[PDB]
Amino acid sequence: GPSVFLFPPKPKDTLMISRTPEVTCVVVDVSHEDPEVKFNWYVDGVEVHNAKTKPREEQYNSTYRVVSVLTVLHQDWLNGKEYKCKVSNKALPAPIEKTISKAKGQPREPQVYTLPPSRDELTKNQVSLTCLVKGFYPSDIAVEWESNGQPENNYKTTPPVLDSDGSFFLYSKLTVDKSRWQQGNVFSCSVMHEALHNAYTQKSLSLS
Amino acid sequence: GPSVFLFPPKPKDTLMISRTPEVTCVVVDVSHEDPEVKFNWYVDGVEVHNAKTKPREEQYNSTYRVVSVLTVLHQDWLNGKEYKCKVSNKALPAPIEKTISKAKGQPREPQVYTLPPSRDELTKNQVSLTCLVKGFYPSDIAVEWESNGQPENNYKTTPPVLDSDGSFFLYSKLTVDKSRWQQGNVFSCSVMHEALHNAYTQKSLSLS
Numbered sequence: 001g002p003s004v005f006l007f008p009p010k011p012k013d014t015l016m017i018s019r020t021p022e023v024t025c026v027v028v029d030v031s032h033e034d035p036e037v038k039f040n041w042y043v044d045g046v047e048v049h050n051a052k053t054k055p056r057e058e059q060y061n062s063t064y065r066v067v068s069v070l071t072v073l074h075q076d077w078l079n080g081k082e083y084k085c086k087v088s089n090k091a092l093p094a095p096i097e098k099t100i101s102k103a104k105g106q107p108r109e110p111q112v113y114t115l116p117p118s119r120d121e122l123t124k125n126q127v128s129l130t131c132l133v134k135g136f137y138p139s140d141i142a143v144e145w146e147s148n149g150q151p152e153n154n155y156k157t158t159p160p161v162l163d164s165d166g167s168f169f170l171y172s173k174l175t176v177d178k179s180r181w182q183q184g185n186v187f188s189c190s191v192m193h194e195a196l197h198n199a200y201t202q203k204s205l206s207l208s
Numbered sequence: 209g210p211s212v213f214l215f216p217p218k219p220k221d222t223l224m225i226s227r228t229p230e231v232t233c234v235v236v237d238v239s240h241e242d243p244e245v246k247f248n249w250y251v252d253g254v255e256v257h258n259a260k261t262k263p264r265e266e267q268y269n270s271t272y273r274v275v276s277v278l279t280v281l282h283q284d285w286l287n288g289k290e291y292k293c294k295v296s297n298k299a300l301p302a303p304i305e306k307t308i309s310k311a312k313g314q315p316r317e318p319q320v321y322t323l324p325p326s327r328d329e330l331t332k333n334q335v336s337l338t339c340l341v342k343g344f345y346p347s348d349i350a351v352e353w354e355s356n357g358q359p360e361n362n363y364k365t366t367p368p369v370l371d372s373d374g375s376f377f378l379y380s381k382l383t384v385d386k387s388r389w390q391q392g393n394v395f396s397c398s399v400m401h402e403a404l405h406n407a408y409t410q411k412s413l414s415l416s
């Protein structure tokens with residue numbers, strides 16, 4: 001029969017008030033013989049009615065895919081409420097339940113430090129700007145770089161690493177042309193995490 | 209039936225000539241029912257009889273786990289020789305074969321940079337010393353911290369991260385008491401990788 005997959009909002013969506021976090025209930029392997037699918041949604045066990053269900057869609061394997069999207073309140077998700085998708089279909093003897101909620105654990109505020117390139121890297125035509133983010137908990141986090149308030153794309157970020165104290169750390173590396181670093185351009189490492197005041201903090205880095 | 213997992217030598221073992229690297233063939237889910245397991249090993253497809261099978265061990269789940277280890281020559285591993293473990297068990301209709309060799313791809317020399325603590329971190333009573341190693345290929349690498357010859361306790365190293373150019377980078381974070389840093393003690397990041405000269409380099413960091 002059909003299977004159900006329940007997706008969480010992205011961290012950044014729950015941590016920025018102007019964004020809209022959603023959880024997504026995807027239903028695959030629905031048959032032509034039993035194509036009707038019903039969604040029921042619950043927040044902490046209370047039925048909720050404002051989900052948006054798109055009409056079913058083809059799939060090249062002759063099964064249907066159907067998705068229901070539930071907008072969540074930023075505060076509900078961050079406060080650990082449980083989101084349940086129920087999904088009914090005639091091929092099933094019993095409707096399928098999936099539940100999802102934010103990672104548990106006592107939250108711990110990231111500390112964020114920017115580190116300029118080693119002097120030894122100064123020969124090269126590109127140099128590395130490092131943002132260390134440490135001491136955070138829930139591992140869920142967003143780290144981004146900008147300059148002139150616009151995104152700097154050329155970075156990579158390590159996964160969270162469990163530290164000796166049970167918190168997480170990571171590093172992000174932004175690679176820039178040496179000239180930009182030498183012209184005194186200011187670069188900024190932005191971190192969004194639930195344990196941050198207003199869920200955000202920024203540290204800047206420039207030639208000293 | 210049983211499952212088999214074939215593991216490579218530790219990079220520190222392949223890269224230091226005084227050490228002896230081994231490939232490890234482990235068989236789990238071996239039944240009491242039919243407990244016999246035979247091992248045939250091959251390097252570049254020719255059989256060796258140089259391997260050592262360890263005596264079976266009953267686990268907490270009642271199954272047996274059975275380990276064969278094959279010593280490899282450093283140059284054979286580094287020159288890309290292929291090692292095959294063939295495992296035969298009565299509960300197998302046919303032997304399970306696993307082959308392993310070192311990661312393919314043109315070797316690229318790590319650039320190793322030490323980064324001192326951010327000034328903002330001086331308000332803590334411990335500080336972070338950062339070792340950035342980038343531009344390396346095979347991701348296989350060993351990175352260690354020490355001071356005055358002695359290995360440092362409190363450090364953690366991210367896994368290798370695939371960079372935009374197809375090389376890897378990582379960071380290693382060493383945590384020390386601020387006083388040690390401000391005392392003027394010298395700390396050293398040691399890196400072992402196939403594409404380094406003598407497979408080894410070390411870079412120091414201290415307060416000026």
Ligand SMILES: *[C@@H]1O[C@H](CO[C@@H]2O[C@@H](C)[C@@H](O)[C@@H](O)[C@@H]2O)[C@@H](O[C@@H]2O[C@H](CO)[C@@H](O[C@@H]3O[C@H](CO[C@H]4O[C@H](CO)[C@@H](O)[C@H](O)[C@@H]4O[C@@H]4O[C@H](CO)[C@@H](O)[C@H](O)[C@H]4NC(C)=O)[C@@H](O)[C@H](O[C@H]4O[C@H](CO)[C@@H](O)[C@H](O)[C@@H]4O[C@@H]4O[C@H](CO)[C@@H](O)[C@H](O)[C@H]4NC(C)=O)[C@@H]3O)[C@H](O)[C@H]2NC(C)=O)[C@H](O)[C@H]1NC(C)=O
Pocket residue numbers: 003004005007024026028029059060061063065
């Ligand atoms: C018929 O077709 C459909 C449609 O797709 C295709 O159509 C054509 C064009 C071809 O391309 C074909 O590929 C195919 O026909 C098929 O539908 C697929 O069905 C499979 C299962 O059979 C689903 O696999 C699951 O994938 C999810 C992750 O899915 C996200 O990422 C995918 C890319 O990796 C992406 O394709 C998906 O769309 C989805 O994308 C995300 O979607 C959300 C919502 O919109 C979005 O917000 C995100 O940003 C987006 N992210 C992206 C892009 O990455 C994966 O999580 C599932 O793994 C779980 O379940 C497995 C069991 O199958 C199990 O092996 C894993 O362990 C894992 O199990 C979970 O384990 C964790 C931890 O252990 C646990 O917490 C969970 O509870 C547990 N859950 C379990 C057990 O279920 C899973 O692999 C595809 O998503 C789905 N594709 C689409 C587009 O819907 C269908 O299979 C075909 N039917 C046939 C051939 O019979």
Ligand SMILES: *[C@@H]1O[C@H](CO[C@@H]2O[C@@H](C)[C@@H](O)[C@@H](O)[C@@H]2O)[C@@H](O[C@@H]2O[C@H](CO)[C@@H](O[C@@H]3O[C@H](CO[C@H]4O[C@H](CO)[C@@H](O)[C@H](O)[C@@H]4O[C@@H]4O[C@H](CO)[C@@H](O)[C@H](O)[C@H]4NC(C)=O)[C@@H](O)[C@H](O[C@H]4O[C@H](CO)[C@@H](O)[C@H](O)[C@@H]4O[C@@H]4O[C@H](CO)[C@@H](O)[C@H](O)[C@H]4NC(C)=O)[C@@H]3O)[C@H](O)[C@H]2NC(C)=O)[C@H](O)[C@H]1NC(C)=O
Pocket residue numbers: 213215216232234236237267268269271273
């Ligand atoms: C009964 O118990 C036994 C023993 O387990 C133990 O039992 C008691 C004591 C409990 O307390 C348990 O806590 C304890 O674990 C069970 O045996 C286990 O079986 C599972 C699978 O069922 C194995 O999982 C695999 O693990 C390997 C990695 O294993 C290394 O890392 C483990 C921790 O991460 C570590 O504990 C293992 O010992 C091993 O550690 C390494 O060991 C070597 C050799 O000594 C050493 O050199 C290293 O230093 C050391 N490393 C570390 C970390 O110390 C993992 O790779 C496997 O993933 C493969 O298989 C999956 C599919 O089966 C697949 O999803 C993965 O992608 C990957 O699959 C492979 O993928 C590649 C490409 O990516 C491909 O080339 C391969 O062909 C492909 N294979 C397949 C099949 O597709 C997997 O996660 C455990 O290792 C094993 N535990 C031990 C200790 O042996 C047994 O399962 C139990 N019986 C039952 C029925 O329940």
